[PDB]
Each structure stands twice: as structure tokens, then as C-alpha cells.
């Protein structure tokens, strides 16, 4: 989409795509930067 | 396949 999208989806644990994350409010939060295309729909 | 919540408000 632009320079380098930022992965910020939430999960139940650091995802293989977001080795860096944080568990808050019970879910997770991604703080990585990647953009191999427009997006993952 | 990365994440479904990709942040990119600025194509």
C-alpha cells in the first residue's frame, strides 16, 4: 500500500509473522513492519 | 501471508 505497512493485528501469542508482540486486554498486538503487497484482505 | 490487520492508511 505505501512505504512499509505496519503489522498491528492482535493475537493470542507472538505470531510467526510478528515475533515481536505484546499481550494486552487478553489479546496480542503486533508492532512489526512488513508489506509484501497491498494487504492480506 | 502476514496479518489481517495491516496498517497502511496512505497508498
Do A17 and A11 touch, CB atoms closer than 8 A? no
3-class DSSP state of A24: strand
Output the CA angle A20-A21-A24, nearest 5 degrees.
Answer: 165
Question: Which CATH number is A23's domain given?
Answer: 2.10.69.10
8 Å CB contact of A30 and B5: yes
The residue range of the domain holding A22 is: 1-41
- The number of domains in chain A is 1
CA distance, residue A15 to nearest chain B CA (Å):
9
The strand pair at B6-7 and A32-33 is best described as unpaired
Enclosing H/E stretch for A30 = strand A27-30
Tabulate helix, strand, coil % of chain B (nearest 5).
Answer: 0, 20, 80
For residue B3, CA distances in Å to A13, A23, A28, A37 come to 13, 16, 12, 12
- Strands (E) in A1-41, as ranges, are 6-7, 21-24, 27-30, 32-33
Angle (nearest 5°) at CA B7 between B5 and B10: 140
Neighbours of A37 (CB within 10 A): 9
Give the number of beta-carbon pairs within 8 Å between A and B. 46
Name the method of structure determination.
NMR
Nearest 5 degrees, angle CA A16-CA A20-CA A23?
Answer: 100
Amino acid at each position: 500500500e505505501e512505504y512499509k505497512c505496519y503489522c498491528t493485528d492482535t493475537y493470542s501469542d507472538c505470531p510467526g509473522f510478528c515475533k515481536t508482540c505484546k499481550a494486552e486486554f487478553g489479546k496480542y498486538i503486533c508492532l512489526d513492519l512488513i508489506s509484501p503487497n497491498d494487504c492480506v484482505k | 501471508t502476514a496479518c489481517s490487520e495491516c496498517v497502511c492508511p496512505l497508498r
